[PDB]
Design a protein around this ligand. Structure first.
Ligand SMILES: C/C(=C\c1csc(C)n1)[C@H]1C[C@H]2O[C@H]2CCC[C@@H](C)[C@H](O)[C@@H](C)C(=O)C(C)(C)[C@@H](O)CC(=O)O1
Ligand SMILES: C/C(=C\c1csc(C)n1)[C@H]1C[C@H]2O[C@H]2CCC[C@@H](C)[C@H](O)[C@@H](C)C(=O)C(C)(C)[C@@H](O)CC(=O)O1
Ligand SMILES: Nc1nc2c(ncn2[C@@H]2O[C@H](COP(=O)(O)OP(=O)(O)OP(=O)(O)O)[C@@H](O)[C@H]2O)c(=O)[nH]1
Ligand SMILES: Nc1nc2c(ncn2[C@@H]2O[C@H](COP(=O)(O)OP(=O)(O)OP(=O)(O)O)[C@@H](O)[C@H]2O)c(=O)[nH]1
Ligand SMILES: COc1cc2c(c(OC)c1OC)-c1ccc(OC)c(=O)cc1[C@@H](NC(C)=O)CC2
Ligand SMILES: Nc1nc2c(ncn2[C@@H]2O[C@H](COP(=O)(O)OP(=O)(O)O)[C@@H](O)[C@H]2O)c(=O)[nH]1
Ligand SMILES: Nc1nc2c(ncn2[C@@H]2O[C@H](COP(=O)(O)OP(=O)(O)O)[C@@H](O)[C@H]2O)c(=O)[nH]1
Ligand SMILES: [Ca+2]
Ligand SMILES: [Ca+2]
Ligand SMILES: [Ca+2]
Ligand SMILES: [Ca+2]
Ligand SMILES: [Mg+2]
Ligand SMILES: [Mg+2]
Ligand SMILES: [Mg+2]
Ligand SMILES: [Mg+2]
Lengths: 440, 428, 439, 431
């Protein structure tokens, strides 16, 4: 009941999916062959972990997930890796030719050849559900498949599932690990296209994650592997409310009510603490107060922006591990008197708290120290608009000269689609301004 | 005037309702299986007000459990006295109401409401002479607020001449689940003004303040708040459940307590409330119960009664005590605060005494006031509503379920009229 | 024998009726069984007690009474009680739900549905009367049933038995006892609708009975039982002339003749003496002069008021026990010289005296001590208008704000009835002022 | 897989093509017989891009050898890896082309093009997923420049959505004294500007100057020039042949490197290039490599990047090195030369690192630049064309095959336009 189907699109979506499902398996005690010794319900159940795993008669716990990519090399690693026995072959869909970092190819030329097959597999997953709650979609902004195919997919899902809720986990481009100079184009196009079809979207700034790995983890040159293990910790914290239950656990949809005051303003800022290496964790024991203060340090955000220069519209704190409410309350009382936390005048100044008692988990060979308690903060702040502004600026620099545009026109797109998307971004920035202005 | 049909809806409605049935079952000598094991026939003289008789000297609560998600009612089945409820009176959906009044009242709730009415109708048919209905719910969520008020409207349609009575929990930022609570509560108050005869306003802000300031509990849980609610619900219903010098029912109570049809929102209170642990054994006295029962800090809906006037007051004392001392104390309390009682309703304070104290206490007192200071409560919700509504924040959760802004504007106007009505009698 | 039929309406009427019929049986030596050994005429007779009791061929003595309540729990007590065998089922009429302290609900809503059954049961008792003189009606002012249903009943009795007399025993509301907030409303509404249908009404103020029980019986917190046993002693004093051989107030018309010169001013003040605690071991026996003086003490009256500041229209002294006319005349000679007793100019300044030789009976286990002589004074004085002033003032306070009015309009009554009744009360106060004052 | 079809036309095309196959066969562990004998599995992960897998674990170059004279064919066949090429993929004529572009493009070449297309089709039909074609040829002669650009047109008509990639050797009087080379080149650039998606400009003038001034070689031979070509071709195809993230196929490279369809002519460079005497006393480091592949004298096109602006740049490092250091050095060089990079294309320098170094080097670096300064190359060929066309020298040589004079005028005006475009984007500002 309340099942969630995860959809991993493109290299970023797939590799992040890999990280997440390995971590989920560790958190629930599911082995790489799908067996879950601790589950005495054989063939099914209504446990909290069933929101994410279906069960076969032979006792296998199978991710409610589809992995999709327009070329095979990335999914082939899943097909031959440690968790290859976890997924049914039908959940892993690949084409033969990718989108060449081109949104036009992902949404049209190549995407149209595989979209129906993908929807058919999603339908098979949906039919196994007694109360499908919605979808979680993992993709990059910059790739041709992550942008174009994801947009196409979201539009088709709005047709087949109506207003059934669709959440995004989106990789926002950063120069340090960038693979295309056209990532700003793809980013603006996909954001314009999916804006109406997404209910909530968690952006992960690759530069922010890169910086956190370098600073807090003492990793000289962080790879995708480093970044993805951190990202999965954030995703796990966000979905823990769906996968575990407890007296003080709060469902993600309850937070979602607080996080989205208007349909378009649906981009929460995530912060996660503590991020610390084993070497540095061997000495300090980080208290509830310490990790909560960490949440209001700009260097710990998943998107580079300055919340001090914006206004808050919602703050949710998602604790997991050894945390009792008395200590949360005392911590929050401290932050309210030491930090510059300005709310809009139309929204109550209050922190929404959820606590999961299951301790954070680390993957063996990881870089994160095992800690006793952790917190993920989700806030809706106008400061996240800074991220849109930087992207829009790169778009404008190239689009004034129409650089690289012929690659999109050649694949059937028109310049009108570009200026449409950019005006929608301009309106989004103006929206973030209006919600911040004091009432009359 | 015998049978009352009880309905509890949503998470808060079912949690407080379950405690209500635990507490009064203990008082009436009913065990979690429904068998009587008490020592007095005082326990059984009016047991039929709230319980039906089955086969084998079994007593079954005349109670209907409603929710749009199964979680809370599984907790009720698994909890103490879960076995006491009629299995067929559990009516629940699977979708939930997402803390959304519109979902509870118009879309998800509309699909479940007829099933609930089948059970209500079946229970009413078994009543020798049905008095009316009591409903437990919160106003800040979706099922209790939205579907509870939908249920009330349907019941008034099918039983227009019976008393409709609610125990309604008001939201507060101090104990809040979502920001949209002021929307859900304003929409519900508009329904209550129109379709209930008596409404006990149980304010989560006051419950919190009592647990914090008075009982010295740093981290108040819903369990603490609900123990306060259970004690107040037991006290207000004493007169209905036990024999005494008062043969009252819901209708006589309403005629005596409600001078104008819209002003039917009561301010309940309980005494004693004492933090641990030395005083816990100290013998409490009638003058201390009477003075504590009228203290503003002891009220379960906090609207400093000193800022308003009392239209009517009912006071219920429980345990063995001197009725002469009770009279003297109530008289002197009135003489000491007679500026706080409207002079145009003579003898508007009524005292009742019941011999059986609640479990755990030698004596107690329960306050029921119809005071103009309740306006502060509606004023508080009204401000939270307008701060958001003026910017139309969070409206999309409601507009997407079919509602439009006019309905919000109407509810807000109706509640401001209620405030100015209370204000009108505060100065007369 | 001219027979008299008692109608007991609502909780107060029924409980007072219980107390009265218990006391009647004790006074006439009628067993709870219904047998009366001293009655040698089996199955009939023309004795004075036959005015209140019928007879069966089996020697059962049946009260000429009817009990009406709109809810059953109070009459149930009559059914399952000591004198349960005295009555038969046709005499006890119960309903399902009561009038909720709402005059309109008792008169209009629920009364309409049960009035014909009640009159049918009354017609059955009247059909067994060779010469019915009229009715004695017991009810509270404040109850919904006692006020609303009673007035409807009085209207119908005036239609079905136009010639017969109707006497009221009425309980005036008092906060010290157990009053609902809207009792003043019901009191004025019922007084207005009944005014022209009642020939003589005996008001008993619960406040006065309460204080008599505290002051003279040392009862800390009087219950309905204490109050009703004292009230029934008063009622017994008033009806004894109808239940025993005698020549004063021997039929109901005589009550009007001796006590009510103006029909509207038909509210006699009852004063009773002595009230002696049954706990007091050694009590000195009061003389005729002493109990007769007590008849002029405000503390002994059924309504707290000051007869000194009023005018008398009639006075009736009813003695029970060891009393001789010589001592009554001596007592009257003294009282007239030591008291402020002013009569209206258009009446004689005099006293109608009645002596019943049989002494007051006290319920075994009651609060009242057996005495050798008692007196009940019935005086038509304008001072009782104080009771109306108090009531009308409370009415004005609520009615000025229309407080609680919606409860009455909701049952089909028009708001205008409220004003009509209040003007009638203003006229009643004015009538008293004319009879009693001399600017 | 994501297969590439290789085509080599003419003398120059077949010489540099053959060395290309020799060098990458060594890098992937393929012996001259076509058997695999390497150690690392990275050698076979993407072997399919350039090799078919036949029976017996043999690997056959997906290559087509074309010429208008039987010569070379034999030298290739009687060379180091001659027995590795598929016998049916040799398509040769006899008449020759005599360094006459018209003979290659319109007459004798046209007579042979259909035989070549059948082999192209036969190789393509067996590709699991063909990505495009690469052609090696010269612009100075007749077969490669004339029949090569004809092959390009014919292939572009049957596979219009595939990438057309060329390695085009530019003519210089310091290496070839054949007089009509300036004419042949101009006719070829006219074709390349319109029918190829990406063209590596391999300049014989620059190869000559690197050998003379940097390697200090008295008399540079074609073997020297071709060793530079083979090192560059190895580098610029590293990302295609080994597992990697950046520029992993022809289309992603083009999408990253070609901001405007006509400006698709790349300027390659290689590092290290060290004179024999200095190698012993010159450290081989990441800062050394980065500094040197941005040096104007190290470009394999005779031009000065300091004279123009970089539209886009791809840099590829090979061998065991520190990713942190590469990142720091590449940013350093962009910071210290910022004015030389157009400001309206953010993040226009992309960097890949492959762990497998080329033969004989601990580490190397390859530069692929799309710079406006390449206009200098097209100006040089334009100068030599206008000094040979004003007096109509040799025109008959081409009119004798049917060509009108305007075809020379259009091929020249189109090249002047190409220069003007490079200048247009060289002067465009962002503010
Ligand atoms: C009358 C009480 C105590 C008391 C005071 S003096 C005496 C002899 N007893 C009760 C009040 C009962 O109505 C019930 C509400 C109490 C709520 C508790 C569940 C509370 O959460 C608990 C943790 C407490 O703080 C106390 C145990 C101190 C509680 O008894 C407070 C109180 O007034 O209890
Ligand atoms: C610079 C070189 C090596 C080196 C090793 S340590 C260092 C600073 N440099 C190699 C690089 C090899 O890619 C090959 C290009 C050389 C082409 C040869 C045909 C060249 O013409 C040859 C005759 C030479 O000049 C040397 C033999 C000195 C050559 O090995 C050095 C050189 O520049 O190439
Ligand atoms: N955090 C993270 N970012 C990644 C990962 N893989 C790619 N990216 C980023 O995603 C962007 C490129 O999108 P990709 O996912 O590689 O592209 P794709 O969806 O395969 O699209 P095409 O290859 O064009 O069909 C760049 O900004 C990369 O840095 C990954 O595993 N983790
Ligand atoms: N003296 C005396 N007063 C009584 C008794 N019972 C009720 N009262 C008084 O009567 C008034 C209330 O009227 P009730 O007789 O209870 O009401 P009712 O006629 O039954 O009408 P409803 O119950 O409203 O339908 C109050 O003033 C009570 O104090 C009684 O037994 N004796
Ligand atoms: C069964 O429950 C109750 C029912 C009633 C009353 C009441 O409060 C004492 C109750 O117990 C709490 C009641 C209330 C208020 C009154 O005055 C405002 C009144 O006049 C009168 C009353 C009650 N009557 C008396 C004499 O107390 C009748 C209605
Ligand atoms: N006092 C009290 N309040 C509660 C309880 N549960 C929920 N609430 C309050 O009820 C509101 C949320 O309503 P809820 O009952 O959960 O929603 P519903 O299930 O849709 O009807 C919030 O203001 C909560 O503070 C409870 O057990 N006790
Ligand atoms: N770098 C290089 N250039 C060559 C080679 N062979 C010929 N050239 C150049 O090729 C041009 C003429 O090309 P050629 O192969 O003879 O023409 P074709 O065979 O008729 O197409 C001249 O400018 C030569 O400098 C070679 O092996 N390497
Ligand atoms: Ca299971
Ligand atoms: Ca449903
Ligand atoms: Ca139905
Ligand atoms: Ca007889
Ligand atoms: Mg991919
Ligand atoms: Mg809830
Ligand atoms: Mg009654
Ligand atoms: Mg040659």
């Amino acid at each position: 009941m309340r099942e969630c189907i995860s959809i991993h699109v493109g290299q970023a979506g797939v590799q992040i999916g890999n990280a997440c499902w390995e971590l989920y398996c560790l958190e629930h005690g599911i082995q790489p062959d799908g067996q879950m010794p601790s589950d005495k319900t054989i063939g099914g159940g209504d446990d909290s972990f069933n929101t994410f795993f279906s069960e076969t008669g032979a006792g296998k716990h199978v991710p409610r997930a589809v992995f999709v990519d327009l070329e095979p090399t990335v999914i082939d690693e899943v097909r031959t890796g440690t968790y290859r026995q976890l997924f049914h072959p039908e959940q892993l869909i690949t084409g033969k030719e990718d989108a060449a970092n081109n949104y036009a190819r992902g949404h049209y030329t190549i995407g149209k050849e595989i979209i129906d097959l993908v929807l058919d597999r999603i339908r098979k997953l949906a039919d196994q559900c007694t109360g499908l709650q919605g979808f979680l979609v993992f993709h990059s902004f910059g790739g041709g498949t992550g942008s174009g195919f994801t947009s196409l997919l979201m539009e088709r899902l709005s047709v087949d599932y109506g207003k059934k809720s669709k959440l995004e986990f989106s990789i926002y481009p950063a120069p340090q690990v960038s693979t295309a100079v056209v990532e700003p184009y793809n980013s603006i196009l996909t954001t314009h296209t999916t804006l109406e079809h997404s209910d909530c979207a968690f952006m992960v700034d690759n530069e922010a994650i890169y910086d956190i790995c370098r600073r807090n983890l003492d990793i000289e040159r962080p790879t995708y592997t480093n970044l993805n293990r951190l990202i999965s910790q954030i995703v796990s914290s966000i979905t823990a409310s769906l996968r575990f239950d407890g007296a003080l656990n709060v469902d993600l949809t309850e937070f979602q009510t607080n996080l989205v005051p208007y349909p378009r303003i649906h981009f929460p800022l995530a912060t996660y603490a503590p991020v610390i290496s084993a070497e540095k964790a061997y000495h300090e024991q980080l208290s509830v107060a310490e990790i909560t203060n960490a949440c209001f340090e700009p260097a710990n955000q998943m998107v580079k922006c300055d919340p001090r220069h914006g206004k808050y519209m919602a703050c949710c704190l998602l604790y997991r591990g050894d945390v009792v409410p008395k200590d949360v309350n005392a911590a929050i009382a401290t932050i309210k008197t030491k930090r510059s936390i300005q709310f809009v005048d139309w929204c109550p100044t209050g922190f929404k708290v959820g606590i999961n008692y299951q301790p954070p988990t680390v993957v063996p060979g990881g870089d994160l120290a095992k800690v006793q308690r952790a917190v993920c903060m989700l806030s809706n702040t106008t400061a996240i608009a800074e991220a849109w502004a930087r992207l829009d600026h790169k778009f404008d620099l190239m689009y004034a000269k129409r650089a690289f545009v012929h690659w999109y026109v050649g694949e059937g797109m028109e310049e009108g689609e570009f200026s449409e998307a950019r005006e929608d971004m301009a309106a989004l920035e103006k929206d973030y301004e209006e919600v911040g202005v004091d009432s009359v | 005037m015998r049978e009352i049909v009880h309905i509890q809806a949503g998470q808060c409605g079912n949690q407080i309702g379950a405690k209500f049935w635990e507490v009064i079952s203990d008082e009436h000598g009913i065990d979690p299986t429904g068998s009587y094991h008490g020592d007095s026939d005082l326990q059984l003289e009016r047991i039929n007000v709230y319980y039906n008789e089955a086969t084998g000297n079994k007593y079954v609560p005349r109670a209907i459990l409603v929710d749009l998600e199964p979680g809370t009612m599984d907790s009720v089945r698994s909890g103490p006295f879960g076995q006491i409820f009629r299995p067929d009176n559990f009516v629940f959906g699977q979708s939930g109401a997402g803390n959304n009044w519109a979902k509870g009242h118009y879309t998800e709730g509309a699909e479940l409401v007829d099933s609930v009415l089948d059970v209500v109708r079946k229970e009413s048919e078994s009543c020798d002479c049905l008095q009316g209905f009591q409903l437990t719910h919160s106003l800040g969520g979706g099922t209790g607020s939205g579907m509870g008020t939908l249920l009330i409207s349907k019941i008034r349609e099918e039983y227009p001449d019976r008393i409709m009575n609610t125990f309604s929990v008001m939201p507060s930022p101090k104990v809040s689940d979502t920001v949209v609570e002021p929307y859900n509560a304003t929409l519900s108050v508009h329904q209550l003004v129109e379709n209930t005869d008596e409404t006990y306003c149980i304010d989560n802000e006051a419950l919190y303040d009592i647990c914090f300031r008075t009982l010295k509990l740093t981290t108040p849980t819903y369990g603490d708040l609900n123990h306060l609610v259970s004690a107040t619900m037991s006290g207000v219903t004493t007169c209905l459940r036990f024999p005494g010098q008062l043969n009252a029912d819901l209708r006589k109570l309403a005629v005596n307590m409600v001078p104008f049809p819209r002003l039917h929102f009561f301010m309940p209170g309980f005494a004693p409330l004492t933090s641990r642990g030395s005083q816990q054994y100290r013998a409490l006295t009638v003058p201390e119960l009477t003075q504590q029962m009228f203290d503003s800090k002891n009220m379960m809906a906090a609207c400093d009664p000193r800022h308003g006037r009392y239209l009517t007051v009912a006071a219920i004392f429980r345990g063995r005590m001197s009725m002469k001392e009770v009279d003297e104390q109530m008289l002197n309390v009135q003489n000491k605060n007679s500026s706080y009682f409207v002079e145009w309703i003579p003898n508007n304070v009524k005292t009742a005494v019941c011999d059986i104290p609640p479990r755990g206490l030698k004596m107690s007192a329960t306050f029921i006031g119809n005071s103009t200071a309740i306006q502060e409560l509606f004023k508080r919700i009204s401000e939270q509503f307008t701060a958001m509504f003026r910017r139309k924040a969070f409206l999309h959760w409601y507009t997407g379920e079919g509602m439009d802004e006019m309905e919000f504007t109407e509810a807000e106007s109706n509640m401001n009229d209620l405030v100015s009505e209370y204000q009108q009698y505060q100065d007369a």
